[PDB]
Ligand SMILES: Cc1ncc(COP(=O)(O)O)c(CN[C@H]2[C@H](O)[C@H](O)[C@@H](OP(=O)(O)OP(=O)(O)OC[C@H]3O[C@@H](n4cnc5c(=O)[nH]c(N)nc54)[C@H](O)[C@@H]3O)O[C@@H]2C)c1O
């Protein structure tokens with residue numbers, strides 16, 4: 001069996017976790033937290049990193065700290081994982097869906113301007129599959145409208161864009177450390193920012209809105225979105241070998257790049273923009289429109305051959321919760337939801353492994 | 367330490383099993399095993415593990431249909447999450463006073479607060495003591511209201527032969543580091559209602575349709591517990607009686623020495639409706655005293671003795687001051703004079719004494 005993603009706990013994870021257990025610091029109180037944060041902040045080259053329980057709560061906490069609320073509009077790509085839009089909804093705000101680029105799958109900056117209104121407060125570029133959005137044109141449209149930018153970098157730890165790491169481009173950014181992620185904590189998330197004020201607000205809200213100086217004295221309504229010492233310990237040990245893990249994944253992409261040619265025009269290989277490092281959290285192809293099969297059957301057929309795969313997201317506006325947000329200008333997102341396929345991408349796959357997926361695809365793409 | 371975890375069971379092993387098999391996220395068999403074991407322990411049909419006690423309250427309320435325009439009765443005297451959870455739904459907390467001895471929701475003050483908007487009542491079992499449920503459940507029945515127990519601090523408590531978590535339409539617990547059963551951070555919802563449980567599971571899991579990769583029929587949350595968390599909780603639950611017994615010992619100790627103290631403090635009232643687990647041993651400091659409750663904490667600390675104030679009621683703090691009424695006097699009185707003394711399984715009778723050295727050397 002070839003799994004689509006899998007962690008590679010080949011560092012201090014086990015030992016750092018035993019330290020947690022042995023010292024009994026297993027809750028959201030512990031040394032690993034601030035250490036994983038600091039190390040994470042260094043890695044992104046930002047001033048602050050705020051560890052959360054998951055990528056979804058990281059998004060929600062960031063938005064609320066940014067002051068997003070009822071009446072506000074936040075521009076979000078329709079093609080993304082639902083938490084991007086849900087996080088806006090939790091705030092009482094309205095997601096304003098935008099189309100993406102047919103090759104990078106990312107928010108198409110040329111389509112932003114027209115979506116801007118008196119209620120717009122922020123734009124949420126989402127760096128799908130490990131590739132960062134074309135940030136230059138996005139920030140200049142934002143700057144021109146005095147809008148905030150929050151990167152949804154859930155799937156992009158380690159990616160770079162014109163010398164800056166994902167996480168250091170927008171006013172703030174969030175990451176996920178779910179089990180299939182480049183860096184995992186089992187479940188976990190992180191917000192990054194260089195804004196002191198924003199960081200304090202996030203921390204205050206993350207820790208139940210409690211006055212740090214007054215036990216049980218709460219100036220505002222907050223949340224319980226803290227990460228545990230155990231999650232942080234695993235995260236620390238993972239980031240410790242982030243380069244190694246990134247290398248392994250690049251090793252895999254190369255095989256894909258080297259052997260995909262075998263399928264000819266049957267798939268479109270992921271386009272890599274030349275702006276910085278694409279970390280390939282997943283290697284995603286667009287199946288040729290010529291095939292007779294459907295993307296879903298291919299998924300079935302690969303599974304039947306003992307090969308895991310995932311569909312590129314169903315766009316927000318085609319699903320029940322956000323169908324009310326549909327517009328006539330979300331066509332690339334739909335096209336992409338129909339023909340995209342994430343292929344197995346993880347540090348444990350072997351050349352052979354790849355050969356197997358390629359052979360399976362050669363076989364199933366018809 | 368006012369509280370501390372007691373990891374003297376299979377926690378480490380169960381955790382190394384998640385590391386060793388690599389199931390460390392919110393997929394692992396420990397999650398369902400812990401839920402099953404916990405449900406059985408509570409004597410209920412379903413248990414839904416969550417990432418903490420606060421999200422467990424939120425999830426429960428949302429799954430109960432609580433929303434904008436609804437009202438939920440909540441004691442002013444409680445941990446803030448009880449009220450915030452209602453706020454998250456866009457609902458309005460309607461504060462009620464508590465009993466001066468048990469610190470729990472005063473059932474006699476309930477019917478007066480019911481309105482056309484009331485959809486539920488949230489009795490909070492503070493300090494390991496279950497509210498006086500009978501009346502609470504009748505008033506609710508009478509008004510067709512739902513009851514959600516915030517049982518965060520009361521795992522193992524019993525009321526008339528029934529365990530906390532099995533009395534209302536649903537209930538929630540917290541497994542924070544200082545709890546009777548801990549998972550580091552973690553929570554659970556219990557219920558006998560199949561519909562409710564299904565809805566809670568759907569929402570807990572990002573609203574995803576379990577049979578369609580990335581197909582979501584509703585807006586959910588990411589409120590899942592990790593396999594590692596459930597592994598720790600399964601292990602702790604395994605030794606629940608053992609941990610409860612240890613607390614009982616510490617308790618018998620306080621009880622038997624509090625006396626030296628006479629009346630500069632008031633010992634915790636224990637209702638005889640079932641077992642009081644004493645997540646914390648809480649006294650109300652004596653009226654006459656020249657010092658202040660926070661000075662006692664302060665002093666207590668300098669002496670290297672950790673303690674916590676009984677909660678400041680919601681209505682006196684900024685987020686909920688607009689909900690103040692003139693009939694939350696007991697809450698305020700308790701917030702003023704209440705004190706939780708270190709209460710945990712790793713404390714010694716010596717520990718106690720010394721706690722007491724200071725309590726005598728400090729109640730002025
Ligand atoms: C743009 C964006 N924004 C925000 C978010 C939200 O972040 P978060 O999920 O709240 O942290 C996300 C989150 N995206 C992830 C989510 O975290 C989500 O959970 C995930 O859905 P999934 O594909 O259905 O996840 P899965 O089927 O549970 O796990 C995928 C593979 O990873 C493996 N795996 C997961 N956990 C483990 C583990 O602990 N151990 C091992 N060995 N394998 C694991 C599974 O066995 C599968 O092979 O994939 C999504 C694309 C995002 O993409």
Ligand SMILES: Cc1ncc(COP(=O)(O)O)c(CN[C@H]2[C@H](O)[C@H](O)[C@@H](OP(=O)(O)OP(=O)(O)OC[C@H]3O[C@@H](n4cnc5c(=O)[nH]c(N)nc54)[C@H](O)[C@@H]3O)O[C@@H]2C)c1O
Nearest residue numbers: 024025026027224369418419420445447518540542543544
């Ligand atoms: C009625 C009610 N409803 C809902 C909730 C919310 O549930 P949750 O917190 O969302 O799970 C709660 C939550 N109550 C707890 C909260 O979970 C909470 O965080 C806690 O606040 P705190 O007093 O400020 O907690 P602390 O100072 O961080 O920890 C207290 C002691 O426990 C220790 N401790 C915590 N975690 C660990 C650990 O992992 N290991 C060790 N050795 N000690 C630990 C600390 O060092 C302290 O000595 O006390 C509150 C009463 C509740 O009471």
